[PDB]
Structures are given as structure tokens and as C-alpha cells.
Amino acid sequence: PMATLCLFDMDGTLTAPRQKITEEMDGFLQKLRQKTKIGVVGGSDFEKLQEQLGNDVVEKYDYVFPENGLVAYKDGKLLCKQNIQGHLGEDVIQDLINYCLSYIANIKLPKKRGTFIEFRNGMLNVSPIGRSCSQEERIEFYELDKKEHIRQKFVADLRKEFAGKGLTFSIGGQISIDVFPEGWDKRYCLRHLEHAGYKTIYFFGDKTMPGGNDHEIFTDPRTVGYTVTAPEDTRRICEGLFP
Amino acid sequence: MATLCLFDMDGTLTAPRQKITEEMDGFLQKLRQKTKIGVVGGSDFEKLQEQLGNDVVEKYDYVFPENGLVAYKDGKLLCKQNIQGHLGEDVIQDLINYCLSYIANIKLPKKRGTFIEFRNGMLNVSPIGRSCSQEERIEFYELDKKEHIRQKFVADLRKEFAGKGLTFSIGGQISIDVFPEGWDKRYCLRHLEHAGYKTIYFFGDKTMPGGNDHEIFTDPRTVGYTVTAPEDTRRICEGLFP
Numbered sequence: 266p267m268a269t270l271c272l273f274d275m276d277g278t279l280t281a282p283r284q285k286i287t288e289e290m291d292g293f294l295q296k297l298r299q300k301t302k303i304g305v306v307g308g309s310d311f312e313k314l315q316e317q318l319g320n321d322v323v324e325k326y327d328y329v330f331p332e333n334g335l336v337a338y339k340d341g342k343l344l345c346k347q348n349i350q351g352h353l354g355e356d357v358i359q360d361l362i363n364y365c366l367s368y369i370a371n372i373k374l375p376k377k378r379g380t381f382i383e384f385r386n387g388m389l390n391v392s393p394i395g396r397s398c399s400q401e402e403r404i405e406f407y408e409l410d411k412k413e414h415i416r417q418k419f420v421a422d423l424r425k426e427f428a429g430k431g432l433t434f435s436i437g438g439q440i441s442i443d444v445f446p447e448g449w450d451k452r453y454c455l456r457h458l459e460h461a462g463y464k465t466i467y468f469f470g471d472k473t474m475p476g477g478n479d480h481e482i483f484t485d486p487r488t489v490g491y492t493v494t495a496p497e498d499t500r501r502i503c504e505g506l507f508p
Numbered sequence: 509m510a511t512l513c514l515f516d517m518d519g520t521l522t523a524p525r526q527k528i529t530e531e532m533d534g535f536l537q538k539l540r541q542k543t544k545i546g547v548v549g550g551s552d553f554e555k556l557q558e559q560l561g562n563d564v565v566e567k568y569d570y571v572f573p574e575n576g577l578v579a580y581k582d583g584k585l586l587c588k589q590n591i592q593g594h595l596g597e598d599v600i601q602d603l604i605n606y607c608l609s610y611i612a613n614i615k616l617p618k619k620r621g622t623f624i625e626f627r628n629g630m631l632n633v634s635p636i637g638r639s640c641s642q643e644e645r646i647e648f649y650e651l652d653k654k655e656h657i658r659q660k661f662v663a664d665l666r667k668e669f670a671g672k673g674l675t676f677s678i679g680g681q682i683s684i685d686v687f688p689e690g691w692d693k694r695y696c697l698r699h700l701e702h703a704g705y706k707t708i709y710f711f712g713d714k715t716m717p718g719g720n721d722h723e724i725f726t727d728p729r730t731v732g733y734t735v736t737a738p739e740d741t742r743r744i745c746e747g748l749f750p
């Protein structure tokens with residue numbers, strides 16, 4: 266076990282998106298854990314991982330990397346911590362926030378709500394409609410956006426305004442744009458693993474194509490990456506690697 | 509003739525943000541045999557359930573979460589209203605756009621997230637962001653007292669929007685509350701004023717100017733009594749309904 270690590274994205278890879286892991290998947294993972302170390306990484310925060318993977322998540326995985334590894338647990342205890350304001354500084358943080366606030370104020374939408382800017386440890390989540398919107402409101406924006414390309418234009422303008430300042434901008438989900446320091450995608454968690462001496466770090470994700478949130482870690486030479494369709498696919502591949 | 513005892517929750521029926529004691533809940537059910545009872549609070553239905561019990565709608569003749577924007581009578585849901593329906597989506601968005609642009613032009617030591625929190629009865633607007641840490645709240649609060657950041661913001665909001673039927677009030681250490689005129693606790697009185705009660709007694713702990721019971725207390729449709737704690741509420745009710 267100790268020589269290799271199977272590192273899994275959570276949403277769409279270990280669980281159905283935003284849903285609790287199944288008892289079958291949980292049983293499979295602990296059996297797999299007898300043959301390899303296992304870890305989980307995702308953009309969601311620790312409390313969301315607890316809700317989906319169990320309150321005892323840090324005991325069920327050898328590594329737990331909420332927020333792409335900006336928060337990190339090894340063997341049930343916290344590793345070092347970093348956050349966006351500590352890396353970027355308050356001036357750049359405020360420039361980013363001010364630009365996004367002013368930009369959103371000039372977008373004409375059917376509806377606006379609240380939580381246009383969600384401040385997290387490893388990123389800002391920015392939404393023209395507001396992340397507190399209801400499901401009916403979220404789908405309405407999503408369908409409008411696929412026609413008007415509001416988020417695509419926003420991302421392009423952000424890249425122009427902040428070129429060279431060390432930030433990455435990405436379309437996220439149905440209503441948001443993710444703003445984060447370059448390299449603070451899932452690859453960040455590799456910082457906690459690359460010197461541990463594992464013979465192989467396998468990675469499994471469901472969004473490995475360009476623009477997806479597994480793409481960079483999937484293509485990173487430090488991992489042996491696999492694309493999965495759903496948790497059943499993850500099991501099938503893992504059974505082949507660790508019979 | 510028929511009377512109604514209408515209670516604020518936090519600090520009146522319970523300790524602030526805490527579950528009702530078994531003592532008070534038992535007293536209320538006895539009192540209910542002599543007068544109708546109801547509860548009103550700014551918190552949402554699920555918070556009332558957390559503090560007053562998941563069966564709250566069956567233990568009170570009236571339940572008014574969110575100041576009565578949601579209303580229950582005799583265990584049944586009556587009707588609902590929200591800020592976007594009352595103002596219309598265009599005005600909501602004009603208000604939100606103005607606040608976002610304004611906040612972007614305030615120079616602060618730190619900005620965080622949740623500058624606009626959207627609720628069905630109000631917006632909570634914060635130049636620093638409602639997600640900020642406790643240390644950051646104090647830093648902003650103290651800076652604001654010297655620089656008058658929220659006072660200037662509220663003045664500009666009143667100038668731009670008050671004709672849309674909105675009230676703006678400084679709230680807590682970091683926020684500005686934005687809500688339609690009369691959407692304080694008085695809102696729930698529309699569900700009661702034509703019922704034919706001889707007296708609507710009201711009980712609350714924040715009945716002075718600035719407190720969230722002040723307007724409903726001073727409204728002529730209620731006979732208000734100020735309480736210092738749940739035990740004081742029980743004392744007064746026992747005198748009114750021996």
C-alpha cells in the first residue's frame with residue numbers, strides 16, 4: 266500500500282455530483298486502501314467533503330485535500346495552510362474584487378440576487394447572478410449564458426485587465442467564474458505529495474478535457490491520469506490496477 | 509372577547525439564539541387555553557423550528573417567520589411575499605447594481621465576500637463583506653466610526669432610492685439593512701388587524717428606537733409590553749391572564 270497513491274477527484278468521480286458517496290463505493294475504497302494509499306481532492310471546502318464523504322473523512326482517506334489542497338490533511342492531521350490573501354496581498358485582492366463588482370453592476374440580466382463574490386481560502390467565486398440564487402434562477406441564467414456568452418466575455422475581460430499579475434480565470438459550473446493564483450487548481454495538492462517517494466500517483470477525474478477542473482492535474486507529469494465517466498468507472502479501473 | 513398574545517422570539521420567548529426552555533414552552537401551552545398566541549421573528553421558518561420545535565406551527569395559533577412575510581394561521585400556510593415581487597426585478601437589480609458599484613469605489617484595508625446577502629425580506633449590504641472574520645469585523649467597525657463609511661453610504665442610498673419605498677438602516681458592525689418601508693415586525697399585523705380581536709398584546713425585548721420590536725410596539729394596533737427576559741415575559745402574561 267505505502268508505495269503508491271490513488272488520488273481521486275470527488276464530484277463525478279467518487280460520488281454523483283454534490284451527492285453523498287454510496288455505501289458500495291465506500292466499501293470499495295476501504296478494500297482498495299489495503300493495496301494502495303488513497304486520497305481525495307476537490308474544489309469544495311472541508312465541510313462539504315464531510316457532508317458527502319462522511320464526518321470522519323480524514324480517517325477514511327490517507328490524504329484529504331479540500332479546496333484543491335490549500336487545506337490539506339495527511340494521516341488525519343492538518344498539513345500547512347495557505348490562503349489567497351496571504352499569497353496575493355490585500356491590494357491585489359481588492360483590485361480583483363473591485364473590478365468584478367463594477368463589472369457585474371454593468372451586466373444586464375433577468376434577475377440578480379446575492380453572493381456575487383464568495384471569498385474562499387484558495388479562490389474567489391464570482392457570479393453575475395449571485396450564488397444564493399434558487400435552482401429555477403440558476404438554470405435560467407445558465408441557459409441565457411449559453412446563448413449570450415456573458416461568462417466567456419467576463420473571463421476574457423478579466424484576463425485582459427489582470428494579464429501578468431499571476432492569476433487564472435476559469436468558467437465554473439453553471440453560474441460562476443473561478444479566480445485563483447496560477448497553479449492553485451488541483452495541482453496545488455501535488456506540493457504535499459511530490460517528495461513523499463511514492464512509486465506512482467494515480468489520478469482519477471471526470472473533467473480532464475481543457476477547461477475542466479481536472480485537466481491540469483490529469484496532464485501533469487507527476488501523475489498517471491485516468492478519465493472516468495462515473496464512480497462505477499472509477500471502480501472498474503482501480504480493480505484492474507489493483508486486482 | 510378574543511385576545512391574541514403576539515411574541516417576539518429572541519430574548520422574549522428564548523435566550524438570544526437559543527432553544528426555548530421546557531419551563532417556558534409549558535407555560536405557553538397553558539396560556540394558550542386563555543388567549544390565542546403567536547410568534548413573530550426576523551429569522552426564517554427553519555430557525556424558528558430550531559428554537560421553538562419542528563412542530564411550531566401546531567403549538568402557536570400564528571407563526572410569522574421573516575417578520576410575517578411568511579404567515580401561518582391555525583397550522584396552515586396562508587401566503588408569502590418577497591422583496592423582488594414587491595419591488596419588481598428591475599428595481600431590485602438597480603438597487604444591487606448601485607450597491608456593487610458603490611462598494612467597488614470604497615477604499616478599505618480589506619475586502620472579502622458576500623457584499624450583498626439576499627433575503628426574501630431584505631438585503632444586507634456590507635462594504636467589507638459579510639463573510640469577514642471576527643478580527644476583520646472589529647477593524648472595519650472602528651475604521652467606520654472615524655471615516656463614516658456606512659453613514660455616507662446610507663445617505664447616498666436614501667438619496668438615490670428612498671422614493672421606491674425603501675428603508676435603509678445601519679446594522680451591526682459591518683452592514684446596512686435594506687428593506688421595503690414597513691417590512692419590520694409591523695408587516696405581520698396585516699394578517700391580524702381585521703380578525704376582530706379586542707386586544708392584540710405584543711411582547712418584545714428591543715422596544716426602543718433602533719430595536720427590532722420598536723415599530724410593532726409603538727404601532728397603535730398593539731398593546732405592547734417590554735420584557736427583559738423570558739422570565740419577565742412569563743410574569744407579565746401571568747398578570748394579564750390570571
Ligand SMILES: [Cl-]
Pocket residue numbers: 274275276306307308309478
Ligand atoms: Cl472539484
Ligand SMILES: [Cl-]
Pocket residue numbers: 516517518548549550551720
Ligand atoms: Cl427578530
Ligand SMILES: [Cl-]
Pocket residue numbers: 379380381382383621622623624625
Ligand atoms: Cl456579494
Ligand SMILES: [Cl-]
Pocket residue numbers: 732733734
Ligand atoms: Cl413596557
Ligand SMILES: [Mg+2]
Pocket residue numbers: 274275276277278470471472
Ligand atoms: Mg469532478
Ligand SMILES: [Mg+2]
Pocket residue numbers: 482483484485486487488489490
Ligand atoms: Mg499525468
Ligand SMILES: [Mg+2]
Pocket residue numbers: 516517518519520712713714
Ligand atoms: Mg428580541
Ligand SMILES: [Mg+2]
Pocket residue numbers: 724725726727728729730731732
Ligand atoms: Mg402598540
Ligand code: NA
Pocket residue numbers: 310312313
Ligand atoms: Na462552506
Ligand code: NA
Pocket residue numbers: 670671673
Ligand atoms: Na418617501
Ligand code: NA
Pocket residue numbers: 717722726
Ligand atoms: Na419611534
Ligand SMILES: [Zn+2]
Pocket residue numbers: 586587588
Ligand atoms: Zn397575503
